Amino acid sequence: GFTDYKVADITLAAWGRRELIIAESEMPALMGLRRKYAGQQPLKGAKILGCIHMTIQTGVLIETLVALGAEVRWSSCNIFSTQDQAAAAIAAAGIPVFAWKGETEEEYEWCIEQTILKDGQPWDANMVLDDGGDLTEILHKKYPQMLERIHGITEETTTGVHRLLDMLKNGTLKVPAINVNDSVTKSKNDNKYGCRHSLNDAIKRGTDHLLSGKQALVIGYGDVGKGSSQSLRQEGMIVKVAEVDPICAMQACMDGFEVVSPYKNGINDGTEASIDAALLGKIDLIVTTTGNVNVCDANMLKALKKRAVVCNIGHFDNEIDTAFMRKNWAWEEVKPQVHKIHRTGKDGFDAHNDDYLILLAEGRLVNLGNATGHPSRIMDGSFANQVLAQIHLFEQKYADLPAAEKAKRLSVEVLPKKLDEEVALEMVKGFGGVVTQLTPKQAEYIGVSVEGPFKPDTYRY
Amino acid sequence: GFTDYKVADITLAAWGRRELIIAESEMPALMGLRRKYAGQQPLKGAKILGCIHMTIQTGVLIETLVALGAEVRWSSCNIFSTQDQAAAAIAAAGIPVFAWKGETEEEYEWCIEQTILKDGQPWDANMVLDDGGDLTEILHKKYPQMLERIHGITEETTTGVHRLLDMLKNGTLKVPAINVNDSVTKSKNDNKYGCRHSLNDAIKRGTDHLLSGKQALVIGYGDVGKGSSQSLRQEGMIVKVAEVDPICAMQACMDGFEVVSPYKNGINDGTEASIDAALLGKIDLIVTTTGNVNVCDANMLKALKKRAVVCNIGHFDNEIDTAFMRKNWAWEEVKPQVHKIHRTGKDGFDAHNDDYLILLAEGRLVNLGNATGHPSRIMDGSFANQVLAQIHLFEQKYADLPAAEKAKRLSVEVLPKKLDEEVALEMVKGFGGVVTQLTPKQAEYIGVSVEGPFKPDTYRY
Amino acid sequence: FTDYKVADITLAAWGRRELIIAESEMPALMGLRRKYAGQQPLKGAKILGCIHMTIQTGVLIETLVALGAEVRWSSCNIFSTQDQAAAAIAAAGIPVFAWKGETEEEYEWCIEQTILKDGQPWDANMVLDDGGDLTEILHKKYPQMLERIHGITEETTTGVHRLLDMLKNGTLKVPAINVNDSVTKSKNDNKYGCRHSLNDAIKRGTDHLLSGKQALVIGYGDVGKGSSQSLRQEGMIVKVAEVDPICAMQACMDGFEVVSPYKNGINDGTEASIDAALLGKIDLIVTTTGNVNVCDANMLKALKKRAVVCNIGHFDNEIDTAFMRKNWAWEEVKPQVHKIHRTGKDGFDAHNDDYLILLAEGRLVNLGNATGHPSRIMDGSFANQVLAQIHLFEQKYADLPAAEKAKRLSVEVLPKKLDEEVALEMVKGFGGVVTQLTPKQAEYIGVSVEGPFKPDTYRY
Amino acid sequence: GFTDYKVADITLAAWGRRELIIAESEMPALMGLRRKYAGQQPLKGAKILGCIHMTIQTGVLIETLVALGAEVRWSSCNIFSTQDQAAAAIAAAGIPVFAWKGETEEEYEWCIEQTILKDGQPWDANMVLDDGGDLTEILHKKYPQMLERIHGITEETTTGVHRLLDMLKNGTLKVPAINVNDSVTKSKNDNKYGCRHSLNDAIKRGTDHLLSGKQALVIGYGDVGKGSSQSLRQEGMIVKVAEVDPICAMQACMDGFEVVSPYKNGINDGTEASIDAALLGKIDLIVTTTGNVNVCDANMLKALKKRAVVCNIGHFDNEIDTAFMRKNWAWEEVKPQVHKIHRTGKDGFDAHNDDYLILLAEGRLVNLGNATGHPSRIMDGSFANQVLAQIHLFEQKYADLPAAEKAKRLSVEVLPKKLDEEVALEMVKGFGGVVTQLTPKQAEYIGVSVEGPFKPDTYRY
Ligand SMILES: NC(=O)c1ccc[n+]([C@@H]2O[C@H](COP(=O)([O-])OP(=O)(O)OC[C@H]3O[C@@H](n4cnc5c(N)ncnc54)[C@H](O)[C@@H]3O)[C@@H](O)[C@H]2O)c1
Ligand SMILES: NC(=O)c1ccc[n+]([C@@H]2O[C@H](COP(=O)([O-])OP(=O)(O)OC[C@H]3O[C@@H](n4cnc5c(N)ncnc54)[C@H](O)[C@@H]3O)[C@@H](O)[C@H]2O)c1
Ligand SMILES: NC(=O)c1ccc[n+]([C@@H]2O[C@H](COP(=O)([O-])OP(=O)(O)OC[C@H]3O[C@@H](n4cnc5c(N)ncnc54)[C@H](O)[C@@H]3O)[C@@H](O)[C@H]2O)c1
Ligand SMILES: NC(=O)c1ccc[n+]([C@@H]2O[C@H](COP(=O)([O-])OP(=O)(O)OC[C@H]3O[C@@H](n4cnc5c(N)ncnc54)[C@H](O)[C@@H]3O)[C@@H](O)[C@H]2O)c1
Ligand SMILES: Nc1ncnc2[nH]cnc12
Ligand SMILES: Nc1ncnc2[nH]cnc12
Ligand SMILES: [K+]
Ligand SMILES: [K+]
Ligand SMILES: [K+]
Ligand SMILES: [K+]
């Protein structure tokens, strides 16, 4: 009689299990780790708080951690990203999970709290796995005593790493962390190619709009913006790219994109006069990818072409001034996570009004909100890194170390390149790719071991 | 009465000057450096030994250094890469240059020595600009006393940087260097997009082969191999990629390439039996991009499809076992830098034999050997970095330090990210791109200064 | 009003919301609605319609109605209905018999409910068909009804083939317009529609990464061309099979390796003829041919473990699914997604690794596992349908003297001038601006400034 | 003692022959016709006037017609399209050819005349092969008596076909013609894919400009415009497309291009006010592809961005108003077939003026003028069709019919689909493609013969 969970519909469990069994065949690096370490049980004694999108892919990560000996308590890190059949299958396996698609903000907080508390008292957690830093933030602000027992944080995504680095800079980070994002088999796989697969996927499921021949503006051209621009361009959109980083803008130009600013001369003075109204009046689709605040602002929303689609694929919804739209314009739900925003006014709308925007996932991460996020074979790389980072920090046992040794180890680190390569090798074999072996003379010639690592730590790929 | 040069044909100078004037309009970063620094003359007193392909683009580099106060003596770093109209225009401007297309190895060594020796004695050089490390090697081995007076080396390319780091670890490097290669506006501009532009260019000029629908094998998937693979795929080739680095192989898979090895199970035991004969007998074009030795070896060459094209776009011709082909097979020159290599024997050939390979540029860098290398607007980035690096090491005056101080200063460094971004900004403006400026609130939100730098040094782009 | 059968009438409001959006995506269709509503050119038309009951078909239906027609509608595929579209049409008072997931028997029942009203043949006088099933039932089972019918407007390649065989045999009883071969249909819908919707359906069904994986597309006509591009743009390594060497030449020039599932291309019915090495490397096979058994039993036995199998041609007999029902065990993953266990027929190991994934039980995959073509592409096809319906209805074939009937009993396409007028409205929908020839320029190339701009021989 | 030719340099013949031998291995359909028909000499007694770009590819066509029994007298159909080594190799083989790169207009006419006249009298020609209709026109206008002996014309290109169809409409065409252009293995191969290969090739050879990230305007989107647009887009240009045909414009939208007009509201009223100045002011490259007159007019040239490249890949140079530019602006030759046009006036130019355009090949066919036109493997399809068309008409012997029978036989027709398919099969096999054979049951199912043809004649591919 297991009841230590909360999900939308437990009867979806059999369906979730069927898709988990498929996903395992799409995840050779993660499953290779499961088979490699199952006998050693390197996570025996680990008690992991996890906060990441409760998808089928996260399901395979959860069961790998458990198979290596960990206990876990799990929530999603976004209100719309849970796949309810994934959550059901995890709960039906006797694993505490608190997640459903379509949580309210209040419910989202409650779900994180259900992982932190067991039977009304703080759980004796000793490890954290996080995506975006929400669970990390709640622990440091509301449950600081628990961090006295926690050996480390393994953080999934660019935004959460930024939050960790700010805490470290400020002296407020209480436990060490591994930046899982900046493994090459994560950042340059998940962040870029994941969004390539899943951005156009989400726009199609939400609107079924033809994309070919239409105009797109992508705000940002980091890993997520590069992959997002590709997602649209490969469908035949005419893509323009905005950037504040001239190196990233240089890449956009060389990649065949016109680089433009929403603001005249690139200068936002906060008034409508600084908006490039002619440019925005021609845009059919705007996608924010920055990790920054208010990069699709109210004046931009006022100027967009009628019936433009607006969405965000960065971690948080404040990339888009949705608060402005809630205050001033009338929202018509088309179907879950698809809203028409009628720019004619606040109090009601004409069902046949033509002056509206279409907002996807209420500005939340659109690939997870309106589709299923990244595919299993991409998340394979990210979640193999997650498992290796959990093992490394749990084995280090930071919480047990004397104070002077803790001080040596209070940092935010990445996994060694050798492990990055071993993850990548299993991914390549999943495609049937064959990696060539250096001869001894060739390895000597370029100064590497036949076994790698093959690049210096400075290398950017 | 200027005679301090050696070029193919001085009457080509007018043509070269016409193309330099065009190249100037395509190189806004370099020309902005001219405008900003000409009055300050930051290279007054600099005496630069330069060794880099004597192209039109290098001409704009040379005249920028001169305009900023330097004296130079120049040679090419490859026997086939000079553009004779560029060499003549430089010589006609009264600048010492020793370079022509189609040098012999002996003539190549002689041309570097004419830069080192003025009127039969060592020139009082104090700066070095190099591409591949050949001039750097000759100074260290044959003219070590000249390095006592030299403040620095600015090294252009990956292979050259590797040779500098080898000297550094072995204690044999005598002066500090700036690794120009690893600016992002160099490595992820020049090395990649430059080869994208110029690889298919050179193959068309040399053979005029249709590439669409034919089978290519690219050896390597670093920056050069990435750009080379794109060069061929965008023409419609079916491109397969070989790699020893699993992370680079993972990128090739995700980029939509099949990853294969010339060797059964990737195991290169040196026998004919290890060659995947079925694979190589399907290949119409093989391109080496590795910076490594013998990656298109004798047994691969024996197995290639009849009439396959063989070429190299890494720095040195030993990527391909051309020595084996010289010893065993008969060479028929089609035209300069295009040879049919008849696998029927050494003593002569049937003019209508069908069993031959086509080798481009005798295995030397094919984009420079059979076309004109990278275009001006791409080399703008590389050569703006070269000029900033020359100013930086010349201002630092390493040669004037005491022995104790030199030891603490001897290093291989990259330019700071702020300068990398400033180069990028000028390139983007050259495309008409408009970079957005952060608001103060946005800059505070992501933790950067509004003027940049916008990324931590760990960032890979 | 009860003259309908849909899955769930309460989905009507949602369907109406999506119709209002689709109208903004269909400028050609809505321009026709606006130009002709006053003249009511379809007043008196009674149209039997058999085509995928999607949101896009809904806008087509309501354009016909807005021009004066009455209609009775069914879907031409058991899996292609969008239930919210069908509910919206039924809620508008329009007879529609269609839901997602019909059995074959329900499929036939639905078409019969359009043909019969109150248990006797409806007084139909026009037909709109997609694939020829409704056309075939009328000729075989209700030939008297064709006495009153002025024509058929047929949507798709397979349906046109069937019309041309009847005309050659002398069994076609009413004239037809081949809507498929308008350029704004064939070279828009058949190609770019599959480009948009094939990778869409495979992602919805499996959520598989496609980049880096190996695909085999069988056929390189308009659907194979668009299908190949749908996969290649995702980063698949796509190989193409063809029996037509001209289409094969295009596949080569477009950057694809052209291969055959059979050694030297010879399909002699033996396992020995299968290129097992080739098929053992394929992660995805898509059939696009309109032919029979082009992914046969022996190919299915030879495919790489866990390969995805689907069909985007009109009919499911492109794949030998009957063989798979007879011999292997089907595990439903979710609706229209089945694991087919090649370990035997009775039962399966839930952790078996030797299975295929079949999408939509071999039926049209873009419609079965996603929503088919997007509104802005279907705008072109369905504007041609409206013009074709108008033309044949105005011609009044069933009312002509027999000598006039004999002169008009044929299968035709719409004139090129109308094809250009549909395209112009599509281009304006993108914000494109077409340039007007000057008089000197028109004279130089020998066209009217108004068009048509190409001879009828032109292939685009 | 063979002197019946005129070429630039007969000593280039050995080089021409090496390239011909390579070309033969790239042209399997054409070489297969040599083998299939050599024994039967189907062209014995044929005397062919040939007028088509005197390239290496035309050399293989010429020697195929001779290998099947024909005599020929040849000229080029453009003043810049000849490869002088091809012309030399043909002359040295004893074949009358009159063609060199860089002819004047007067020399161009003289060369056609030398094919028509032998020893000062009309040659006893009985077949015509033409590219663009210039030879056809001269025959009909100046030598009409010769057409009483000619069995037919085989015309290569769209513009020539239009000129034939005009004559047929007016009743002035004197002999029947094969429209070679409209074989699928010609129009959808040569016109489209040939320009894909060779347009960016010629722009690189002429300017060495980076194309990635720059703005192009392509006028026309028929077969040449489709292939030209792809040539630029695949290099990373941002390509805009103009059309007068809404169906073709629809295809450009769906192919991912923005469709624009040089004129406001698309209305070309001949004034400067009609020009979309903001559009033209941002274009780096304009390419005319139409076969129409003055589609890049004087007001467009005045409005173009400084230093834009201007070129034409349609058959005739009047697509561009170069006459306006000769009459008003100063031309500066960069190198052969590359001119800077200084918009500062007619009376000289400043060597450092920035207000110029770059014109390639003086407005003539840019792929043939600045590079080598289409590659051998593409011209294989076109010229295999030419050979079959020559046999077809020659074996039908129109010139021997009475006038009343000629009238019924006079037509402009395409080759039957069966021959088109047979050419295509040979092209596919040259790539190593394997075509599948229908079973009897499948052939019956779709209503075709196992041997084909596989499509109705209405099919558009
Ligand atoms: N939805 C997903 O599946 C997914 C996956 C990975 C990461 N993410 C999230 O996406 C966001 C971006 O991640 P990333 O890895 O690409 O980070 P990144 O740093 O590589 O890229 C962000 C880019 O935004 C640019 N930018 C910032 N402010 C801008 C502005 N005002 N205008 C234009 N450009 C601006 C920056 O210059 C930078 O290049 C983060 O929130 C990250 O956590 C989402
Ligand atoms: N021609 C040009 O214009 C040009 C431009 C820049 C650099 N280069 C030269 O190109 C070479 C490569 O430069 P880079 O910047 O790409 O270096 P890189 O280190 O980024 O890439 C070289 C790649 O080769 C791979 N490799 C090594 N041995 C291999 C083998 N046996 N088989 C397969 N792959 C193997 C490595 O794993 C690596 O990824 C260097 O010589 C560099 O100087 C040439
Ligand atoms: N799903 C959709 O939305 C959609 C859209 C339009 C048409 N269709 C259907 O798709 C099918 C194809 O339509 P089309 O317009 O592309 O037809 P098409 O005639 O243009 O193409 C079919 C191609 O298949 C090839 N082929 C035939 N038998 C083959 C075999 N055994 N192996 C390999 N290739 C073979 C033919 O040579 C031909 O080129 C028809 O059934 C049509 O009605 C589906
Ligand atoms: N250079 C080459 O190698 C090569 C190869 C084949 C053909 N050609 C020549 O190229 C030209 C085009 O041939 P094609 O086969 O593409 O013909 P096409 O009829 O298929 O296409 C020309 C297109 O130009 C469009 N057009 C006409 N006037 C226009 C205007 N004012 N503005 C915009 N678009 C306009 C027409 O609508 C048409 O679609 C002809 O002269 C042909 O002989 C050149
Ligand atoms: N499918 C997925 N599961 C978990 N985290 C993700 N981030 C992006 N896609 C994801
Ligand atoms: N055009 C060029 N000039 C100088 N060095 C180069 N390296 C690559 N291309 C080059
Ligand atoms: K997923
Ligand atoms: K160059
Ligand atoms: K749809
Ligand atoms: K050529």
Tab-separated table of N, CA and C and ligand atoms in Angstrom, chain A residues 53 131-132 156-160 181 186-188 190-192 194-195 198 218-226 242-245 248 262 289-295 312-316 319 365-368 373-374, chain B residues 436-439 442 446 454-455 459, ligand 1:
chain	number	residue	atom	x	y	z
A	53	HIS	N	12.242	18.235	-14.572
A	53	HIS	CA	11.140	17.848	-15.468
A	53	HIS	C	10.823	16.357	-15.418
A	131	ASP	N	17.646	21.304	-11.483
A	131	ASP	CA	17.586	21.805	-12.856
A	131	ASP	C	16.968	23.192	-12.745
A	132	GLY	N	17.822	24.213	-12.695
A	132	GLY	CA	17.390	25.591	-12.635
A	132	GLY	C	17.613	26.257	-11.299
A	156	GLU	N	21.768	20.946	-13.517
A	156	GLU	CA	21.559	20.516	-14.892
A	156	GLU	C	21.827	21.611	-15.916
A	157	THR	N	21.463	22.852	-15.624
A	157	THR	CA	21.191	23.782	-16.712
A	157	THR	C	21.873	25.125	-16.490
A	158	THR	N	22.093	25.844	-17.600
A	158	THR	CA	22.820	27.118	-17.592
A	158	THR	C	22.326	28.065	-16.501
A	159	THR	N	21.006	28.298	-16.451
A	159	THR	CA	20.460	29.208	-15.448
A	159	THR	C	20.796	28.773	-14.022
A	160	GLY	N	20.680	27.482	-13.713
A	160	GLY	CA	20.993	27.063	-12.346
A	160	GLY	C	22.468	27.239	-12.008
A	181	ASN	N	25.877	21.065	-16.728
A	181	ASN	CA	25.638	21.762	-17.978
A	181	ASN	C	26.860	21.779	-18.881
A	186	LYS	N	26.766	17.545	-22.727
A	186	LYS	CA	25.520	18.150	-22.273
A	186	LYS	C	25.311	19.451	-23.052
A	187	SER	N	26.060	20.504	-22.703
A	187	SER	CA	25.865	21.829	-23.301
A	187	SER	C	25.784	21.787	-24.828
A	188	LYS	N	26.695	21.061	-25.489
A	188	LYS	CA	26.745	21.108	-26.949
A	188	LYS	C	26.002	19.949	-27.571
A	190	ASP	N	22.559	18.441	-25.596
A	190	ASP	CA	21.262	18.806	-25.040
A	190	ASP	C	20.856	20.237	-25.418
A	191	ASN	N	21.650	21.233	-25.001
A	191	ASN	CA	21.196	22.625	-25.108
A	191	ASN	C	20.975	23.030	-26.563
A	192	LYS	N	21.855	22.573	-27.462
A	192	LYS	CA	21.785	22.929	-28.886
A	192	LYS	C	20.897	21.949	-29.656
A	194	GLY	N	19.137	19.391	-28.644
A	194	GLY	CA	17.840	19.132	-28.047
A	194	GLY	C	16.800	20.134	-28.514
A	195	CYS	N	17.150	21.417	-28.461
A	195	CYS	CA	16.228	22.455	-28.913
A	195	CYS	C	15.976	22.387	-30.423
A	198	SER	N	13.251	19.789	-30.601
A	198	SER	CA	12.001	19.940	-29.872
A	198	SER	C	11.361	21.319	-29.997
A	218	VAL	N	14.674	35.090	-33.451
A	218	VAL	CA	15.199	34.369	-32.306
A	218	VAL	C	16.042	35.344	-31.504
A	219	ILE	N	15.669	35.529	-30.243
A	219	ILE	CA	16.394	36.404	-29.322
A	219	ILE	C	17.419	35.532	-28.635
A	220	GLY	N	18.689	35.741	-28.969
A	220	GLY	CA	19.756	34.967	-28.364
A	220	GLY	C	20.331	33.938	-29.330
A	221	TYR	N	21.626	33.665	-29.167
A	221	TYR	CA	22.336	32.769	-30.072
A	221	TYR	C	23.472	32.086	-29.315
A	222	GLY	N	23.208	31.711	-28.055
A	222	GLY	CA	24.043	30.773	-27.311
A	222	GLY	C	23.698	29.364	-27.751
A	223	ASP	N	23.896	28.380	-26.873
A	223	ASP	CA	23.625	27.010	-27.308
A	223	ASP	C	22.147	26.816	-27.633
A	224	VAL	N	21.259	27.344	-26.787
A	224	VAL	CA	19.838	27.148	-27.030
A	224	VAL	C	19.382	27.968	-28.230
A	225	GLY	N	19.916	29.184	-28.390
A	225	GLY	CA	19.537	29.993	-29.546
A	225	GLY	C	20.064	29.433	-30.858
A	226	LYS	N	21.272	28.868	-30.841
A	226	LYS	CA	21.803	28.213	-32.037
A	226	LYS	C	20.921	27.046	-32.460
A	242	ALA	N	18.759	38.015	-32.871
A	242	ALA	CA	19.197	39.123	-32.031
A	242	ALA	C	20.211	38.624	-30.997
A	243	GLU	N	21.168	39.483	-30.660
A	243	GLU	CA	22.187	39.104	-29.681
A	243	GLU	C	22.757	40.357	-29.053
A	244	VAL	N	23.221	40.222	-27.801
A	244	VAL	CA	24.019	41.262	-27.156
A	244	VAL	C	25.506	40.901	-27.158
A	245	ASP	N	25.850	39.650	-27.451
A	245	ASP	CA	27.227	39.178	-27.449
A	245	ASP	C	27.728	39.205	-28.882
A	248	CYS	N	28.805	35.748	-30.410
A	248	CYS	CA	27.673	34.921	-30.798
A	248	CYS	C	26.976	35.495	-32.028
A	262	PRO	N	15.539	44.307	-31.892
A	262	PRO	CA	14.187	44.874	-31.729
A	262	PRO	C	14.194	46.378	-31.582
A	289	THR	N	15.524	32.833	-25.956
A	289	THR	CA	16.451	31.740	-25.654
A	289	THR	C	17.569	32.180	-24.713
A	290	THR	N	17.375	33.245	-23.933
A	290	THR	CA	18.511	33.982	-23.366
A	290	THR	C	18.910	33.589	-21.949
A	291	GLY	N	17.962	33.163	-21.111
A	291	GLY	CA	18.235	33.128	-19.680
A	291	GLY	C	18.223	34.480	-19.002
A	292	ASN	N	17.856	35.529	-19.734
A	292	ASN	CA	17.813	36.905	-19.255
A	292	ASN	C	16.363	37.321	-18.975
A	293	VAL	N	16.165	38.579	-18.576
A	293	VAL	CA	14.858	39.068	-18.137
A	293	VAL	C	14.312	40.044	-19.173
A	294	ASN	N	13.031	39.881	-19.533
A	294	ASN	CA	12.306	40.901	-20.302
A	294	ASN	C	12.994	41.190	-21.633
A	295	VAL	N	13.396	40.133	-22.338
A	295	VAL	CA	13.987	40.311	-23.657
A	295	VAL	C	12.935	40.286	-24.759
A	312	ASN	N	8.794	31.023	-25.416
A	312	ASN	CA	10.064	31.060	-24.723
A	312	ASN	C	10.552	29.639	-24.512
A	313	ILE	N	11.837	29.434	-24.780
A	313	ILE	CA	12.506	28.161	-24.557
A	313	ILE	C	13.690	28.310	-23.596
A	314	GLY	N	13.866	29.512	-22.984
A	314	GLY	CA	14.760	29.633	-21.847
A	314	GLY	C	14.133	29.042	-20.594
A	315	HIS	N	14.910	28.987	-19.517
A	315	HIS	CA	14.435	28.250	-18.348
A	315	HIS	C	13.216	28.901	-17.679
A	316	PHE	N	13.156	30.235	-17.599
A	316	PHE	CA	12.081	30.884	-16.851
A	316	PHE	C	11.217	31.747	-17.767
A	319	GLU	N	11.445	35.838	-19.392
A	319	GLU	CA	12.008	36.336	-20.642
A	319	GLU	C	10.994	37.181	-21.400
A	365	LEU	N	8.855	27.157	-20.589
A	365	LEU	CA	9.671	26.408	-21.551
A	365	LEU	C	8.809	25.664	-22.556
A	366	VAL	N	8.880	26.064	-23.825
A	366	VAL	CA	7.840	25.649	-24.758
A	366	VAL	C	8.078	24.226	-25.242
A	367	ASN	N	9.337	23.786	-25.347
A	367	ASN	CA	9.546	22.432	-25.843
A	367	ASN	C	8.965	21.415	-24.869
A	368	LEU	N	9.131	21.650	-23.561
A	368	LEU	CA	8.553	20.764	-22.564
A	368	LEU	C	7.071	21.045	-22.344
A	373	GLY	N	9.846	17.903	-24.707
A	373	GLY	CA	11.243	18.257	-24.538
A	373	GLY	C	12.160	17.427	-25.429
A	374	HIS	N	13.401	17.269	-24.965
A	374	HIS	CA	14.429	16.620	-25.756
A	374	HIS	C	14.130	15.126	-25.873
B	436	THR	N	22.314	44.078	-30.067
B	436	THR	CA	21.497	44.731	-29.055
B	436	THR	C	22.350	45.096	-27.836
B	437	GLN	N	22.026	46.225	-27.205
B	437	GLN	CA	22.678	46.623	-25.961
B	437	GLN	C	21.797	46.265	-24.771
B	438	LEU	N	22.405	45.655	-23.758
B	438	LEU	CA	21.701	45.354	-22.513
B	438	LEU	C	21.260	46.629	-21.821
B	439	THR	N	20.083	46.575	-21.192
B	439	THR	CA	19.722	47.572	-20.206
B	439	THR	C	20.553	47.347	-18.946
B	442	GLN	N	19.109	44.435	-17.133
B	442	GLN	CA	19.428	43.147	-17.738
B	442	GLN	C	20.871	42.753	-17.472
B	446	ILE	N	22.061	39.112	-15.378
B	446	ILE	CA	22.942	38.011	-15.754
B	446	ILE	C	24.374	38.219	-15.282
B	454	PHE	N	30.810	39.269	-22.057
B	454	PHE	CA	29.478	38.742	-21.844
B	454	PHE	C	29.494	37.291	-21.402
B	455	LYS	N	30.644	36.633	-21.468
B	455	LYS	CA	30.743	35.222	-21.141
B	455	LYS	C	31.928	35.000	-20.217
B	459	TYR	N	33.543	29.619	-21.380
B	459	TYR	CA	32.490	29.426	-22.384
B	459	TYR	C	33.053	28.964	-23.727
E	1	LIG	N1	14.253	24.460	-22.911
E	1	LIG	C1	15.332	23.655	-22.856
E	1	LIG	O1	15.254	22.449	-23.068
E	1	LIG	C2	16.642	24.236	-22.368
E	1	LIG	C3	17.818	23.487	-22.452
E	1	LIG	C4	19.008	24.000	-21.953
E	1	LIG	C5	19.021	25.260	-21.393
E	1	LIG	N2	17.878	25.978	-21.355
E	1	LIG	C6	17.858	27.348	-20.832
E	1	LIG	O2	17.903	28.243	-21.920
E	1	LIG	C7	18.570	29.458	-21.498
E	1	LIG	C8	19.754	29.719	-22.399
E	1	LIG	O3	20.700	28.629	-22.228
E	1	LIG	P1	22.079	28.574	-23.008
E	1	LIG	O4	22.801	27.355	-22.560
E	1	LIG	O5	21.856	28.818	-24.451
E	1	LIG	O6	22.867	29.854	-22.454
E	1	LIG	P2	23.957	30.722	-23.222
E	1	LIG	O7	24.657	31.644	-22.275
E	1	LIG	O8	24.858	29.829	-24.063
E	1	LIG	O9	23.058	31.623	-24.271
E	1	LIG	C9	22.205	32.709	-23.870
E	1	LIG	C10	22.513	33.822	-24.842
E	1	LIG	O10	21.565	34.894	-24.683
E	1	LIG	C11	22.227	36.080	-25.036
E	1	LIG	N3	21.442	37.205	-24.556
E	1	LIG	C12	21.334	37.640	-23.261
E	1	LIG	N4	20.584	38.705	-23.115
E	1	LIG	C13	20.160	38.988	-24.406
E	1	LIG	C14	19.324	39.993	-24.930
E	1	LIG	N5	18.755	40.944	-24.186
E	1	LIG	N6	19.096	39.995	-26.263
E	1	LIG	C15	19.649	39.032	-27.009
E	1	LIG	N7	20.450	38.029	-26.630
E	1	LIG	C16	20.677	38.070	-25.305
E	1	LIG	C17	23.612	35.936	-24.408
E	1	LIG	O11	24.548	36.778	-25.071
E	1	LIG	C18	23.906	34.456	-24.698
E	1	LIG	O12	24.668	34.280	-25.889
E	1	LIG	C19	18.907	29.240	-20.014
E	1	LIG	O13	17.807	29.633	-19.195
E	1	LIG	C20	19.043	27.716	-19.942
E	1	LIG	O14	18.916	27.183	-18.618
E	1	LIG	C21	16.709	25.505	-21.827
